[PDB]
Design a protein around this ligand. Structure first.
Ligand SMILES: *[C@@H]1O[C@H](CO)[C@@H](O)[C@H](O)[C@H]1NC(C)=O
Lengths: 53, 53, 48, 105, 49, 269, 53
């Protein structure tokens, strides 16, 4: 039932700001962002995953 | 740190250039000679303009 | 590059495509693993 | 600019931001703010919440290596290699097995 | 709209990488020498330069 | 008062290019302040030389403890403000027979890459009158009655482990030169390398043109000076000084540079 | 503006405000907003977390 994440993990990365100005290694370093839907819906590829425990 | 900027596109011509330029945020531009006068000019730019020199 | 028509295909499902988008790669910064690149923004998305 | 944030189960908040010029594209001929109760109907493009989606694909493959230096302590002039139940490759330039990949201590 | 497909960079530690000539639109390859990449536990490559 | 790291004499031929080696993995740092103030506490459990150690609990600085066994959650506790006074003692609410073995308290600082640990052997009895705490000569041994709580003390009040400013900001590497015949302390400053990346050279152009260090010197912890077109004014006693005033690291390497012996040189030490 | 605020022991949100025209200055010639990944290095002036002043 939508078990398309049989070979997955969180894929920690290196974000240019973890807060406090300077950069950090974050779990939520967004890698890709696409906005071509003309109704302003931002679609963000985040480094971690959700839902699956 | 500070950003760099996107290298622009250039079109050429007999004794002149035409520089098509792509900003993302308000950025500066400056141009001058190298002779006895500088003949200095400069400009703030915010949109995808092209200029002739 | 940077103008209307930087990427052209013959049909909506044509598998081959023509592209002139001016990809120029720059040298990466000290001790960071990433692929910095310089690119002329979308002619279609700014053209609109 | 854009920011994502969440708080761990160890109750530490983390905010990754990114410079991105979000600008809404204009629809129609009025630079409005929020759509009213009395509108004209114009076609436009949005995202739908379909889960099983066809032909938009990412390549999943093997990770690279995970380097760490915290797993090495001095056992009276020695190099103890704690692994914490995994596979680790060691490398140096002194006597003994100067390179190799162990699995436990 | 175009899409810039950029795969993971090939970091050849203690060696020199070689570019393969493919037939792709705006195909770009460059070998940068003297890289010293950092991960969680220090340098990913054992060699310094 | 700087500790010597290693001492050598270097003899190379005139007309060649000198390479003055100064390397240290403990001086590696980058421009960013990416989790510099990060420490970790972890308690490990072992059961003699012929059993495999298991990590029981760990905790990052300014963070909360992580337990690996669901039964032991809310049972094995550290003080959440352990890092303020250096009181890393572990309170276990109720002991059982399966808890017997040697527990090690490990502190680790990721920036200085320091680790320090001490062991205490826990033995669980049934009679409370056999319960004692003693020092066997190299480790504490705690004898605890069954079901009682155990406070295993691990206190290290060193300035690196307590919650204080804990920001370096000024590690510096110095390259010094002691000219032949010229005594020390009035030595000419040759190179200053600041943790931020800035370098400061002194002297006339004839000296400045030849002295350089690679631009990622502190990034790779290699501060070797490459001096092109060796002149007699380069001979002398060079000193590479790594200074970490906060972590108490003060080390130097000393080089006696002589010009002789092109391929016949004995590399000292 | 500038608004500071806290909540009491007796659950009273105190909030004190002040006028303060805050415009952090540009560094270089690019009116940017936050730190990117790729970018040049220019000297600026910050504060520190120290107390022993
Ligand atoms: C360390 O903390 C515990 C409580 O977590 C406290 O009982 C103990 O007295 C503290 N140590 C010292 C030396 O005060």
């Amino acid at each position: 039932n939508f078990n398309v994440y049989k070979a997955t993990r969180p894929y920690l990365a290196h974000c240019p700001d973890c807060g406090e100005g300077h950069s950090c290694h974050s779990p939520i370093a967004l890698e890709r962002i696409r906005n071509e839907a003309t109704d302003g819906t931002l679609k963000i590829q985040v480094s971690l995953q959700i839902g699956i425990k | 740190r500070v950003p760099k900027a996107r290298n622009p596109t250039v079109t050429y011509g007999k004794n002149q250039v035409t520089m098509l330029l792509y900003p993302d945020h308000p950025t500066l531009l400056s141009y001058r000679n190298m002779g006895q006068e500088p003949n200095y000019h400069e400009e703030w730019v915010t949109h995808k303009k092209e200029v002739t020199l | 590059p940077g103008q209307f028509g930087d990427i052209q295909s013959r049909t909506p499902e044509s598998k081959d495509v023509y592209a002139n988008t001016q990809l120029v790669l720059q040298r990466p910064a000290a001790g960071t693993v990433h692929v910095p690149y310089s690119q002329a923004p979308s002619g279609f998305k700014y053209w609109l | 600019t854009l920011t994502v944030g969440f708080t761990d189960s160890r109750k530490i908040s983390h905010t990754c931001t990114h410079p991105f010029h979000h600008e809404p594209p204009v629809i129609g001929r009025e630079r409005f703010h929020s759509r009213p109760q009395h509108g004209k109907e114009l076609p436009c493009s949005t995202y739908v919440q379909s889960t099983a989606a066809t032909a938009e694909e990412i390549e999943v493959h093997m990770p690279p290596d995970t380097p760490d230096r915290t797993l090495m302590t001095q056992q009276s002039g020695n190099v103890k290699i704690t692994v914490n139940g995994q596979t680790v490759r060691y490398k140096c330039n002194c006597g003994g097995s100067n390179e190799g990949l162990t699995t436990t201590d | 709209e175009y899409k810039t497909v950029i795969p993971s960079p090939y970091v050849k530690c203690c060696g020199t990488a070689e570019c393969k000539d493919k037939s792709l639109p705006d195909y770009s390859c460059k070998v940068f020498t003297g890289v010293y990449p950092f991960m969680w536990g220090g340098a990913y490559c054992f060699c310094d330069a | 008062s700087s500790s010597l790291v290693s001492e050598s004499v270097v003899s190379l031929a005139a007309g060649t290019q000198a390479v003055l080696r100064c390397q240290s993995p403990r001086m590696v740092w980058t421009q960013d302040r990416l989790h510099d103030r990060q420490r970790v506490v972890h308690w490990d459990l072992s059961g003699g030389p012929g059993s495999q150690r298991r990590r029981l609990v760990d905790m990052y600085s300014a963070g909360e403890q992580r337990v690996y066994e669901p039964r032991d959650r809310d049972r094995l506790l550290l003080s959440p403000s352990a890092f303020h006074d250096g009181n890393f003692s572990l309170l276990i609410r109720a002991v059982d027979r399966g808890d017997e073995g040697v527990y090690t308290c490990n502190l680790h600082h990721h920036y200085c890459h320091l680790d320090e640990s001490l062991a205490v052997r826990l033995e669980v009895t049934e009679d409370p009158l056999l319960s004692r705490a003693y020092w066997d000569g190299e480790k504490e041994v705690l004898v605890v009655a069954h079901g009682a709580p155990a406070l295993m003390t691990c206190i290290n009040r060193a300035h690196v482990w307590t919650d204080r400013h804990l920001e370096e900001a000024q590690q510096v590497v110095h390259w010094d030169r002691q000219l032949p015949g010229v005594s020390h302390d009035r030595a000419d400053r040759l190179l200053d390398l600041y943790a931020s990346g800035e370098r400061r050279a002194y002297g006339p152009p004839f000296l400045r043109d030849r002295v350089s260090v690679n631009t990622n010197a502190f990034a790779r912890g290699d501060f070797s000076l490459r001096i092109d077109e060796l002149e007699r004014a380069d001979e002398g006693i060079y000193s590479c000084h790594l200074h970490h005033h906060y972590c108490g690291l003060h080390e130097r390497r000393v080089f006696h540079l002589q010009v002789t012996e092109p391929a016949f040189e004995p590399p000292s030490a």
